Design an enzyme around this catalytic site. Structure first.
Site, PDB file in Angstrom:
ATOM      1  CG  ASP A  39      -1.826   1.080   1.432  1.00 16.01           C
ATOM      2  OD1 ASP A  39      -2.211   1.700   0.426  1.00 16.01           O
ATOM      3  OD2 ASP A  39      -2.261   1.337   2.575  1.00 16.01           O
ATOM      4  CG  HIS A  85      -3.045  -2.728   2.386  1.00 21.25           C
ATOM      5  ND1 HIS A  85      -1.728  -2.809   2.787  1.00 21.25           N
ATOM      6  CD2 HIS A  85      -3.117  -3.391   1.204  1.00 21.25           C
ATOM      7  CE1 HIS A  85      -1.034  -3.489   1.891  1.00 21.25           C
ATOM      8  NE2 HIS A  85      -1.854  -3.854   0.917  1.00 21.25           N
ATOM      9  CG  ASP A 107       5.807  -3.757   7.032  1.00 18.98           C
ATOM     10  OD1 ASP A 107       4.789  -3.825   7.731  1.00 18.98           O
ATOM     11  OD2 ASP A 107       6.460  -2.707   6.922  1.00 18.98           O
ATOM     12  CG  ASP A 108       6.027  -4.440  12.028  1.00 13.54           C
ATOM     13  OD1 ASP A 108       5.210  -5.335  11.708  1.00 13.54           O
ATOM     14  OD2 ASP A 108       5.733  -3.509  12.828  1.00 13.54           O
ATOM     15  CG  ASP A 186      -5.894  -5.043  15.784  1.00 16.52           C
ATOM     16  OD1 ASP A 186      -4.814  -5.000  16.405  1.00 16.52           O
ATOM     17  OD2 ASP A 186      -6.530  -4.019  15.487  1.00 16.52           O
ATOM     18  CB  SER A 217       0.431   1.953  16.959  1.00 15.68           C
ATOM     19  OG  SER A 217      -0.738   1.286  16.518  1.00 15.68           O
TER      20      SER A 217
HETATM   21  C1  UD1 Z   1       1.754  -5.406  16.945  1.00 12.79           C
HETATM   22  C2  UD1 Z   1       0.338  -4.936  16.649  1.00 12.79           C
HETATM   23  O1  UD1 Z   1      -0.621  -5.403  17.298  1.00 12.79           O
HETATM   24  N1  UD1 Z   1       0.226  -4.284  15.490  1.00 12.79           N
HETATM   25  C3  UD1 Z   1      -1.079  -3.899  14.989  1.00 12.79           C
HETATM   26  C4  UD1 Z   1      -1.190  -2.383  14.905  1.00 12.79           C
HETATM   27  O2  UD1 Z   1      -0.318  -1.912  13.897  1.00 12.79           O
HETATM   28  P1  UD1 Z   1       1.060  -1.149  14.189  1.00 12.79           P
HETATM   29  O3  UD1 Z   1       0.928  -0.237  15.349  1.00 12.79           O
HETATM   30  O4  UD1 Z   1       2.011  -2.269  14.421  1.00 12.79           O
HETATM   31  O5  UD1 Z   1       1.406  -0.360  12.867  1.00 12.79           O
HETATM   32  P2  UD1 Z   1       2.221  -0.674  11.645  1.00 12.79           P
HETATM   33  O6  UD1 Z   1       2.927   0.509  11.106  1.00 12.79           O
HETATM   34  O7  UD1 Z   1       3.167  -1.794  11.878  1.00 12.79           O
HETATM   35  O8  UD1 Z   1       1.192  -1.086  10.491  1.00 12.79           O
HETATM   36  C5  UD1 Z   1       0.557  -2.373  10.477  1.00 12.79           C
HETATM   37  C6  UD1 Z   1       0.464  -2.887   9.058  1.00 12.79           C
HETATM   38  O9  UD1 Z   1      -0.303  -1.921   8.298  1.00 12.79           O
HETATM   39  C7  UD1 Z   1       0.382  -1.626   7.099  1.00 12.79           C
HETATM   40  N2  UD1 Z   1       0.003  -0.270   6.667  1.00 12.79           N
HETATM   41  C8  UD1 Z   1       0.400   0.854   7.389  1.00 12.79           C
HETATM   42  C9  UD1 Z   1       0.073   2.109   7.023  1.00 12.79           C
HETATM   43  C10 UD1 Z   1      -0.717   2.316   5.843  1.00 12.79           C
HETATM   44  O10 UD1 Z   1      -1.076   3.410   5.404  1.00 12.79           O
HETATM   45  N3  UD1 Z   1      -1.082   1.148   5.166  1.00 12.79           N
HETATM   46  C11 UD1 Z   1      -0.767  -0.147   5.509  1.00 12.79           C
HETATM   47  O11 UD1 Z   1      -1.142  -1.107   4.841  1.00 12.79           O
HETATM   48  C12 UD1 Z   1       1.867  -1.819   7.409  1.00 12.79           C
HETATM   49  O12 UD1 Z   1       2.621  -2.028   6.229  1.00 12.79           O
HETATM   50  C13 UD1 Z   1       1.825  -3.012   8.364  1.00 12.79           C
HETATM   51  O13 UD1 Z   1       1.969  -4.289   7.733  1.00 12.79           O
HETATM   52  O14 UD1 Z   1      -2.563  -2.083  14.608  1.00 12.79           O
HETATM   53  C14 UD1 Z   1      -3.041  -2.543  13.311  1.00 12.79           C
HETATM   54  C15 UD1 Z   1      -4.558  -2.427  13.332  1.00 12.79           C
HETATM   55  O15 UD1 Z   1      -4.991  -1.098  13.124  1.00 12.79           O
HETATM   56  C16 UD1 Z   1      -2.695  -4.025  13.059  1.00 12.79           C
HETATM   57  O16 UD1 Z   1      -2.777  -4.277  11.658  1.00 12.79           O
HETATM   58  C17 UD1 Z   1      -1.302  -4.429  13.579  1.00 12.79           C
HETATM   59  O17 UD1 Z   1      -1.176  -5.843  13.576  1.00 12.79           O
HETATM   60 MN    MN Z   2       3.838  -2.871  13.576  1.00 15.28          MN
END
Ligand code: UD1
Ligand code: MN
Length: 342
Positions: A39, A85, A107-108, A186, A217
């Site tokens: 995305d 997404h 991805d992380d 989630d 977050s």
């Molecule tokens: C450890 C934990 O519990 N993490 C959760 C947290 O994400 P978290 O706080 O970990 O936020 P991240 O930045 O890791 O994003 C989660 C996922 O969303 C994707 N992403 C991010 C920004 C964007 O515009 N588009 C997009 O697709 C990222 O590539 C990644 O795979 O809350 C999200 C729900 O809201 C969940 O999906 C994650 O599993």
């Molecule tokens: Mn994350």
């Protein structure tokens, strides 16, 4: 049965670390095709993904427009983007590629050596037991001193949806997609209207770990809890084990009997390691205040989603504490969760 790993990516080049480990441990390209859904349109992250060539299938979420959030969510547009997404990526997996199931990996996350072995062994259980709606790699209380390293094969059932490396069936996506939320996907799945009393399998030692310090977050939850979840390092041949103990009719008789058959010990005695001859105990909580106090006293994540504790099953949170197996549990009269426990 082909089980794709759907990698969710956006603007972090460190998706490299995620892909390196998955590809390194993958036992079969045909059995586990990797589909990276990206995305955000971040060029560098795109080039990084592209550099893997045929090792992966790179797809791009088509709608990069900003999202109109509700009045209470000005600061949370990122969460709206994540949900949008997920909806598109999962729809690609089940509607376009038409796979029977998928393991969702952000991805992380770095996967453990037995990540795939774990999912190929539990997939048949998920297919056979409708009271199960997912298989997760994550132990919410999986910190190093809170798990038994001599039991890396030990698995459990949990009412608390962990996400973070999880398998779902196309059958579940059929149920969720029609009502997919605008944000916080989630926590939305953690609600009873979605869960419907179903459980996930989760391990004693996590099969994924997160390094995503900076993300959507803010880093407090990651800094005080998530970063401490230990990645399993000892390969367990789950496909060679008898996992029938995880089926509902066996687990709810045996595991619960195990828990309520265990002696009860005062939380304070557990904390200071008194009465060590009791290698397995039950610390009983009776109300919301006692739950959070005992949880905090023993180092367990103490927040609740829709009334369900982290890694809880019938309210029971199981973990290791100073070498002792502990079941922070409610009285045996427990009869369902209370969303008012916040
Ligand atoms: C450890 C934990 O519990 N993490 C959760 C947290 O994400 P978290 O706080 O970990 O936020 P991240 O930045 O890791 O994003 C989660 C996922 O969303 C994707 N992403 C991010 C920004 C964007 O515009 N588009 C997009 O697709 C990222 O590539 C990644 O795979 O809350 C999200 C729900 O809201 C969940 O999906 C994650 O599993
Ligand atoms: Mn994350």
């Amino acid at each position: 049965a082909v089980i794709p790993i759907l990698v969710i990516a956006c603007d972090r080049s460190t998706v490299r670390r995620c892909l390196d480990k998955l590809l390194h441990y993958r036992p079969s390209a045909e059995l586990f095709p990797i589909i990276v859904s990206q995305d955000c349109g971040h060029e560098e992250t795109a080039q990084v993904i592209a550099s893997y060539g045929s090792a992966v299938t790179h797809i791009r979420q088509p709608d990069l427009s900003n999202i109109a959030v509700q009045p209470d969510h000005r600061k949370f547009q990122g969460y709206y983007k994540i949900a949008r997404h997920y909806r598109w990526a999962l729809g690609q997996i089940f509607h376009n590629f038409n796979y029977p199931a998928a393991v969702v990996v952000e991805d992380d996350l770095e996967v453990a050596p037995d990540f795939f072995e774990y999912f190929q062994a539990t997939y048949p259980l998920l297919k056979a037991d409708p009271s199960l709606w997912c298989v997760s790699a994550w132990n919410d209380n999986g910190k190093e001193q809170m798990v038994d390293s001599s039991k890396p094969e030990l698995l459990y059932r949990t009412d608390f949806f962990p996400g973070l490396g999880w398998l779902l069936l196309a059958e579940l996506w059929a149920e969720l997609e029609p009502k997919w939320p605008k944000a916080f996907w989630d926590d939305w799945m953690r609600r009873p209207e979605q869960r419907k009393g179903r459980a996930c399998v989760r391990p004693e030692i996590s099969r994924t770990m997160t390094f995503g310090r900076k993300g959507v977050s803010h880093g407090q939850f990651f800094d005080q809890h998530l970063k401490f979840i230990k990645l399993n390092q000892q390969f367990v041949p789950f496909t060679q084990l008898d996992l029938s103990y995880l089926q509902q009719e066996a687990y709810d008789r045996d595991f619960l009997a195990r828990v309520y058959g265990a002696p009860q010990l005062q939380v304070e005695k557990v904390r200071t390691n008194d009465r060590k001859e009791l290698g397995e105990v039950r610390v009983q909580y009776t109300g919301r205040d006692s739950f959070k106090a005992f949880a905090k006293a023993l180092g367990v994540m103490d927040d609740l989603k829709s009334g369900v504790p982290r890694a809880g099953y019938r309210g029971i949170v199981t973990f290791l504490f100073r070498g002792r197996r502990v079941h922070l549990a409610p009285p045996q009269t427990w009869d369902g969760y209370d969303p008012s426990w916040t």
